[model samples]
Target chain A: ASSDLTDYVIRQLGRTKNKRYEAYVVSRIIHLLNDFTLKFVTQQFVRLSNKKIALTDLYFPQLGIHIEVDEGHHFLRNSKMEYSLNQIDEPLYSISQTESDAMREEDIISITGHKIFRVNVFKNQEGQPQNLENIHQQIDKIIEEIKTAKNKLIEASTFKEWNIETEYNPQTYIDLGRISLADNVVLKTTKDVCNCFGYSYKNYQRGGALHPYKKDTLIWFPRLYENKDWINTISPDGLTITEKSTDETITLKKLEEWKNGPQKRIVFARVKDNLSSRAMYRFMGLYEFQKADLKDGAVWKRVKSEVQTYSPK
Target chain B: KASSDLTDYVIRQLGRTKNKRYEAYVVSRIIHLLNDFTLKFVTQQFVRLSNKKIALTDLYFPQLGIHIEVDEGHHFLRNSKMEYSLNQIDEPLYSISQTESDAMREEDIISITGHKIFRVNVFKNQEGQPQNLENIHQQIDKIIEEIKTAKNKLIEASTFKEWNIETEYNPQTYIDLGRISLADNVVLKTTKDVCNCFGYSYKNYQRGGALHPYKKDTLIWFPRLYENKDWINTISPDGLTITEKSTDETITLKKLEEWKNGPQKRIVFARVKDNLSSRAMYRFMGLYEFQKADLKDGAVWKRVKSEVQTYSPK
Candidate 1:
């Protein structure tokens, strides 16, 4: 089984073979860290504060660690020549990926409470793939950071004892603390989310519906065309999504009601693995209703990055 | 369970490609105009080039036998200054210009598959920072119409009748009807597709072996052959048996036996190429049962059925 795991890891490394230099550095780092105390998952997702979700190249949940292997794509500059032709964002366009990287790093930290360890596998000075020795050097630095983090946690006598093997449940939830929930946290069904928010999953099961008693609303969208009726288009940053009007009807009057009324619109989006496998509904944070139009359709924008824990009524 | 609907088809097709902006755009455009659910396609399909190297076709409508390449400006440009001069050749009248790579690339696909190669060039005009939306829309419409025209002539020499994505997994769907006996000849470009065919929702895109959901002992094995001394394994000479090279080493194959017998069903994906290599793919080599693993030296695997089939070059 252990050998099987290593073989599995090596096979996974094949998925990034087309990515070139980052492939080598990434495979190398993962192979190097095979003996780590905390297991790491590759091709995971974490929703960013801006509402746009990120496909994390590699993630360690317990440690709140992100090992981002940045490739040439991260350095590509955007063109100012492009304008409101985007039609999605107003009064803005052409922010370089370099700028997005800064915001992404800060935003990820704000949500996870952990700094990202980015391995720059960008092209070297001589217009070649990063040097093998230099790649090794970066891996060593990351190893040092993990070791130090482990040591600090142990010394502080506050290291969280959690294992991926165990199933997360209500008892475990209370054991950890009264409050521990976030959009980035993994959950199975919308029912699990209802359970998290102290609601009967039976009452709310459809794509969009009002709360049984409270002035709260829930919206679920599957962007992969898995759900055909409710087609949706999202902004680049995941800040907003313009849902093409669907089977269950909602008029502009309702949109204006969501805008002014104290109804909390909680959105859940179905996201797939960066591996392009396993679609799961994920919390997309709290959102406020924006205006709806023909071209843009029904636009829903996020008001918060993290979801606050709800107490039972 | 998978369906034959456009949604599932799109999801299944996307599993094989990188799903980049330029490439996926062409697919999206093609699907929008055609609106045909039964349309069969493969992206990043491995085409063995005339030069013995594997070149991945951008988008391939396998049923229509029409290959579409979405070429960015880079395809027409040389990588470096030195190569720009080195491109000159005499016998077949090659030019030093950078445009000839794509020109030669077209000829290679034509030579192997005997199919027409259509390109969705990035820029319609020589001077531009954008894709000509109107031209693209027109090109896509034309391609769909051409395929529509060819559909009537597809019956005589085609594989199984038509692709039914809703139907149960059958090697006949992928393997040509003639090669149905050689089901091992089935090839797919990505690990995700392999997992999909094996009826598993792939989460470990990087892992070699995956256990089927709800079936603990059931597993799919993707074996990469010829790598170092830890396990001197063979990918099998005939498709029938994969066993240790010799009885010299002292290692009991406990792991091999667990997946070899009983309710344990193990499917094998013969790693056709070193999956770590640039243009690698996995071939469905059928099922294998463990023959022996007790020898302190090695273990063995015998094919459940079918002989190892070779990939006919195309």
Candidate 2:
């Protein structure tokens, strides 16, 4: 059975390579395990709901071992130029993308019965590529561990089962009869604000409203259109922002209750165009209702306590 | 009287040029301004000092009431060298000595010629490159402006200020001068005394020597205990100790015997074992007064913990 698995993996490994760093690491692993009969595979894929999903960068079929080479960009949000400028909008986008990728990989691991290992390789002082000797040592250690397991069949039950659907919990509060104007409201905003209020929006496909889990807060997502003239004024002192609109009746009333009730620190997020044509909501921390009057039209003046600018690290 | 003095000064200032590039530029400017009569108008002149003959100015314009002195990068090299030398010494003998010499020379030239001297320092934008034509033209324009100002008597002769070199000595001289004497004279000897003379102690002292800038004064070191039976008899409560005689005792006994007769007091620093390590480190206790063993036994006499006076740097 082990020889059959080795043959299957070697055929799969004959396929075309991926990234340069990944190829270098894979070559080192093959050289380190040259004396052993263990077979290695690259670009291995598993089927999930009729879609083919890549398990990891490298894999061993007989040992059920999967290795992932994570680049610097995987952990950092502002690795690219455009994302560095709009740093406030990048945390959610990068984190969610990472979490979603991990979920898919986890699901593949459950179906395939593979134990995964992650490695981070950084450049040396001379700015050369990853150290091959370090990678060789790591591969040697893994080989020794597998050797100690003693040719016994390490079954698929060791892998954790992952369900993508049940793992996602849409942070929804009061059921307002109003519809959402922005898609993925909280996901497009800053992570600090979301974590502070304990709420996260549903996935990118679904456009909806999300609110704090414990508080009676109603976070309204308002989309700005270039053509439509919305009477909105950001105060000169940067403390208050007044939004006067005749169309937002349900959202305005909910915001009023959020202001007068136990949760007076309600906040708003507006959709703004990013470097790309795609739009995302930029959150303004927390705010309180200063006053609302109906002189010419219904006007709501909300005064914010703190304002934070975006900075990339 | 000023014009007569200026004429003689211009004649003398025209002798030797200081920097090659600056002189060349100044000559070009003067020839452009005076035209055909340039040679008949200007004469090269040299000044004689007690030991050396020095070139004064690059161009001396008697008609314009101006003397142009060109300064090059090399002119500043001596000043920088002197500064570097001063940093290497514990006691700097002179401060800005080169600058003072240059200023005095300029003042002497001014006093003799009565011609207002305008000094110009030229700089290149990039390394190993000559000053561009535009920069030279700008410098010429500045010279011409200074000439006009000198003609109008708008230039002021700066007053020369003198600086005295600091000859202050270190405070270590107050304790001991490294001379051994009898009990009535010299009292103590320690690593601190050795370090103070060498300017390594935490006191100000005139410093300039071949040894390491700070540690030159540290001469004495306490040897390890396992080396020999150089007997250290007892440290009395009244700050006296005794030692027995052995092969190692001869040299130490000789030093103490010398101190018993000489005018300068002799002292030796002692060491104790470190609680944390096997090594023994030395410490500077109070001064010691020494004499021969009163009992005439095979022992040497030593007295310590005597009060010693300290002096501040002047």
Candidate 3:
């Protein structure tokens, strides 16, 4: 049973990828804890009030708490661009880092109701290079704050740790409608994805799927070396894509149709897996097209966060 | 423009890996037809692209610096990745299903080695797989013509240099030459040279992760960015923060469990892109220790310092 919890931590650590600071802070707290049930994740992305995505450095979902590792420049750095973009009325030159951090912390707390703890990495940058006692002390202090919050929540019956050990249902994720899968989730085969949607490849099936009940055209973009008609992912985040030009007049018209076509376009993109050298598809949520004279072929932007719900089999 | 002595080594390596009739058949035919004794050919050439993993080429011509890949049913995909032995660090495709990774593989090799790859597609559209041997023979004839022309053109231009295979290297003398240093983002070609610089004895083509020679409690890890469990070491856009991911892919479960009390430290040399560009190489990511670790989840490493304090052997 304990192994199962450890497995979650290992796999989640694997997911942590390159955010070492996040991994460090979360894992440091985990090391101090005797409780095996406490849950945590690193590199969790949340949508802020302004609709701009804010990356949570380290998150404990159960406690509704986020630990922000202020590794310098995040709040300390000054910029005319930032002030103009943020629309702060005070003179940008005179503004202290705290005012900026306060707005962001409150902005985050208001939306997610999650308390924030800042591990000020820049507290004494000049001396800390030789020693990290300041950062180390903050980590120890953060531990107490978390434990007291946990205890307080436990007495009120509100404390509940996340169970990542639970079996996942793509269908239930569809029914309940949540972004359950990671952004870069991969499956071994195209048919595996087709099975989820109750469809099969009937050659040239891409951009031609007719849902049985809704009759929407399910557009599938495959990154094929053999077929060089489209450059499916123009950007790494799978936010933008483009179709290669054949006949500009013909391509532009097709782009217009997809933008407001007669049938609903449920777009899915096929991407290669990073873990293996072999091929697989990435579920690139859904996308919409552009108008006349779009930047390089038919430009596409991801439209929705949730995958469309399928009928019960 | 040639050396036939290398053919024996080439053919021997090919036999071990490619028992498949087409790879052997096409490769043999090319060697036989292009029997100009002066023109050198090597098989199963391990060409590393600008990424972390190595992709083995079927045949290579050093004089012309040209590569020929023999693609069969397995090489091309119905829409493509696994069945190959390395991880590519980019998620380039939701675009990489077709012969996508296959094409990506060639692109990186071309970009890094500054050479050209000639692919001989066995099948037409990845369909037509069974018993259609005629198309391959047609491609074989086409390949012979291109090589003969390319060989002559390069011979006239005097572009080909004296080619030497990198079979030997000495890190002690190599760094003693002061050719490179261990900086925060300085990239090196392989882990072998880097290990020696930092006092670890690395075997030829050994695993990237290494245990500290005398310090039994510590780990020396070489992790590739976004490669499997070795995911996520990226430099921030502003260039201040260089983040790291989990470690200990090759370490045993027992060591992992015991290391909790051991309070292990990890020193890292991460595989990163040079100047954060398309070129993939290894750079120093300084000393780190497990901020947290459990047998189930991998070790989360935090940087103690961005720079390494080491003296070059005088």
Worst 10 residues of 2 chain A by lDDT: A81-90
- Candidate 3 docking class: incorrect
Candidate 1 Cα outliers beyond 4 Å, as residue runs: A1-16, A20-24, A34-39, A44-56, A60-130, A145-162, A165-183, A200-205, A209-213, A217-228, A231-241, A244-262, A274-276, A290-301, A306-313, B1-314
Model 2, span B202-288: residue lDDT tens: 332222112323322212223221123453343332234434334454565675554345432333334533212224333333344
Q: Against the hidden true structure, what lDDT does model 3 obtain?
A: 0.49
Per-residue CA lDDT of candidate 3, range A1-313, in tens? Answer: 2334433443454441232244344545555443545566554543343433345556666676777664443333233112212211111112233443332222121123467676754444345431233455678888899899889988988555544333223443344443322322334555545545655443344444555435554646455211435433234344555555545566666676656663334454453332223555555566565433555555656677556555435
lDDT of 2 at A307: 30
RMSD in angstroms between candidate 2 and the native structure over all alpha carbons: 32.3
Residues A1-313, candidate 1: write the lDDT tens digits. 1233332343344453323244444545654553434556664444444443344555655566666655544322333111222222111122334444333322221223655676655454366555434656777798788767766766887555534333234234423443333214545556655555555565445655454444665544345221345566555455676666454445444456545765456665665534435544555567777766644466677776655445444
For each candidate, the DockQ is 0.01, 0.00, 0.01
Give a tens-digit lDDT track for model 3, residues B73-128.
Answer: 44433322334332333211112233444344322221113466776765444543
Tens digit per residue, CA lDDT, model 2, A49-117:
222223356765555666755554443323321111111111111123443333331212222234555
Greater TM-score among 1 and 3 belongs to 1
Score candidate 1 by DockQ.
Answer: 0.01
Winner on TM-score between 2 and 3 is 3
Number of the top candidate by lDDT?
A: 1
